Nucleic acid binder design. Structure first.
Lengths: 205, 233, 126
RNA sequence: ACAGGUGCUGCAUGGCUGUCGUCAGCUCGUGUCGUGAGAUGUUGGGUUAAGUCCCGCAACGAGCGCAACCCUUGUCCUUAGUUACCAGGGAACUCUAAGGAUACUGCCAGUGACAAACUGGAGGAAGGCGGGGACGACGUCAAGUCAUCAUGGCCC
């Protein structure tokens, strides 16, 4: 526990906030609470389709939610009937129409959250942690990442003593502020406890 | 020009060895004697060794084989370079990097970096660079080329290594034994003549003698090339 | 009408040089009335006097921000900026005095866990 | 059915944090050496804030650390001039807040291995890392937190 968040330290130099609205000092708190509610609802509902970058920007009441997923087809549904239900469920627990327009991740091996959640799903499927970690490294490296680091922390393989393991390939220079490093941290709820999964994908400058 | 005579070797002083204290006992066979506490080489042996070596390099050049010239001593620094450019063969004159040959797959990256930097300095990409940073990349080029200038166009292991002063270039001999490729080497009367397939007893310290040996090898290789060019039509 | 802008730690001054008797009016008030500090008075009148011309130029200064000595430093800097305007031969002497350099010193911020910019709390081994 | 539990186990854990320590280290691939644990690289001559850089060198390269990229302050320029400013309504100035300029050992003299570099000088608002911050390597303390939270197990 001695490292800054890669996204947060880069929030203004090369990255952008995944929430772009403006409020007044009194309105801001309720905007933020509603935003966090929508985010947690979305991440629990669309847990099948591999969404990674839900972005909330609300211009004057009406909002424009933008989810980026690697599998837009399943979350949109047939002719677009799941997306309408999602639209109205968002609108119900926000103020007025939440236009959710859905992007597409054309390289799911370069997004850190998709890699981390894949490793997590494999871990909850009682797959060897070393093999899952190495598979993710290989997949990202041959998909074209300039660097990938993946850290697995916890009771790995049912071990009584938790340990931290990791693999790195490429550069992933955390201290460089202009590095374009995607980062994700998820948890796999195994049968022996929680295993934390951290993924750094360094893509350029 | 495949047989070198004894007279020019005597003129160049290819017989002056080293002090009798520094001699290698394995060098005893081809030693004439010891005058004024300096060993004298047997030119009868030296000329026959040169004859066999010249026949070998002529055969390699006629089969379009590649021979690496190696010498980093002050006596053989520039002569190796100029004769290698004459013969169109790779050379090593500044310093033999540990692992030029055994670790050849790693040196590929350094040679490729040198080639990329030459290709960008040809068309000119210093416009996008600053005054100091362009000089930084240029000093990178010069430092990297000074180390790998002769082997930048060798592209794979050579089929023979011609070393001057085996004792100085011991690392090259050990690497060549490691990889199995033949060694044509010049041995003074203090060095180890083992792992040298073509032993040439000679003085490797004299500037004139070294120039004579390297030039003779160069003409042998060039004559091999001209003979090989006779089958085009 | 030479114009100089001087700056110090927080105060900013604008001075107007014009050949005259030597009267200095700061913020529409005389320099002595404005500055109760003898040191501040000397600091203001120093750039005029190192080159032997105190009573040669009339000065109209307008200061803002800062404190009593920061404003004096700002006026000195502005007077130097205006002096270099009429003649560039005075610039070497001003440089040798060290009046043309703007003092970049600022109040160092208070850091976290420290009681001041550099003052730390008391430490006990036990 | 269950919910609920600030009930227990930080010595089952995730996440988060302290600390050595913003110390300059910590490693890996290939090559080579050793029966081997390992070594080399990473040591040496200098130099630096720095494993910083140069030169040597059985090493050749790379990675995370250092530095830089980020924020603030120091001078100037440009766009703009209100609710800001006041030299003579003005579009000067301060200021405000965006975008840039400058600073690079760039030039001079010496010392230095024909080096890296250091010492002094000019110009400049600033001179060598201009000042301050954020950024905290592999790891160590079964370090702290089950009472933010999440969670394996135990318990009501």
């Amino acid at each position: 526990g001695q490292k800054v968040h890669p996204i947060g330290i880069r929030l203004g130099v090369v990255k952008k906030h995944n929430a772009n609205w403006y409020a007044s000092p009194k309105q801001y708190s309720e905007y933020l609470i509603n935003d966090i509610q929508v985010r947690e609802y979305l991440r629990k509902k669309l847990d099948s389709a591999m969404i990674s970058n839900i972005m909330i920007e609300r211009p004057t009441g009406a909002a424009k939610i933008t989810i980026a997923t690697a599998r837009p087809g399943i979350v949109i549904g047939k002719k677009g009937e799941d997306i309408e239900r999602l639209q109205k469920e968002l609108t119900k627990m926000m103020g007025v129409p939440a236009q959710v327009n859905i992007e597409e991740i054309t390289s799911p091996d370069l997004d850190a959250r998709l890699v981390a959640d894949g490793i997590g799903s494999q871990l909850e499927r009682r797959v060897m942690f070393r093999r899952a970690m190495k598979r993710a490294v290989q997949n990202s490296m041959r998909s074209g990442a300039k660097g990938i680091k993946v850290e697995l922390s916890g009771r790995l393989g049912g071990a009584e003593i938790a340990r931290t393991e990791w693999y790195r390939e490429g550069r992933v220079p955390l201290h460089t502020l202009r590095a374009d490093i995607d980062y994700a941290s998820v948890r796999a709820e195994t049968t022996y406890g929680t295993i934390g999964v951290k993924v750094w994908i360094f893509r350029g400058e | 020009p495949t047989k070198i005579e004894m007279r020019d070797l005597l003129q160049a002083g290819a017989h002056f060895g080293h002090q009798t204290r520094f001699w290698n006992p394995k060098m005893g066979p081809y030693i004439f004697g010891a005058r004024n506490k300096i060993h004298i080489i047997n030119l009868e042996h030296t000329v026959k060794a040169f004859n066999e070596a010249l026949n070998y390099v002529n055969g390699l050049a006629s089969k379009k084989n590649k021979v690496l010239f190696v010498g980093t001593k002050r006596a053989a620094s520039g002569i190796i370079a100029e004769q290698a450019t004459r013969a169109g063969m790779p050379y090593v004159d500044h310093r033999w990097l540990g692992g030029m040959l055994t670790n050849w797959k790693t040196l590929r990256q350094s040679i490729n970096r040198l080639k990329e930097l030459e290709k960008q300095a040809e068309d000119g990409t210093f416009a996008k660079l600053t005054k100091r940073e362009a000089l930084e990349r240029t000093r990178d080029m010069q430092k990297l080329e000074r180390s790998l200038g002769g082997i930048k166009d060798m592209g794979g292991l050579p089929d023979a290594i011609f070393v001057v002063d085996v004792d100085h270039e011991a690392i090259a001999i050990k690497e060549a034994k490691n990889l199995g490729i033949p060694v044509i080497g010049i041995v003074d009367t203090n060095s180890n003549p083992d792992n040298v397939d073509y032993i040439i007893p000679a003085n490797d310290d004299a500037i004139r003698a070294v120039s004579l040996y390297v030039t003779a090898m160069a003409d042998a290789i060039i004559a091999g090339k001209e003979y090989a060019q006779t089958q085009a039509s | 009408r030479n114009y100089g802008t001087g700056r110090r730690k927080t105060s900013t001054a604008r001075v107007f040089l014009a050949k005259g008797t030597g009267s200095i009016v700061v913020n529409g008030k005389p320099l002595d009335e404005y500055f109760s500090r003898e040191t501040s008075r000397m600091v203001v009148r120093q750039p005029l006097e190192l080159l032997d011309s105190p009573t040669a130029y009339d000065l109209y200064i307008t200061v803002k921000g800062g404190g009593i000595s920061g404003q004096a430093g700002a006026i000195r800097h502005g007077i130097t900026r205006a002096l270099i305007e009429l003649d560039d031969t005075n610039k070497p002497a001003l440089k040798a005095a060290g009046f043309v350099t703007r003092d970049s010193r600022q109040v160092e911020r208070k850091k976290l866990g420290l009681r001041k910019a550099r003052k730390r709390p008391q430490f006990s081994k036990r």
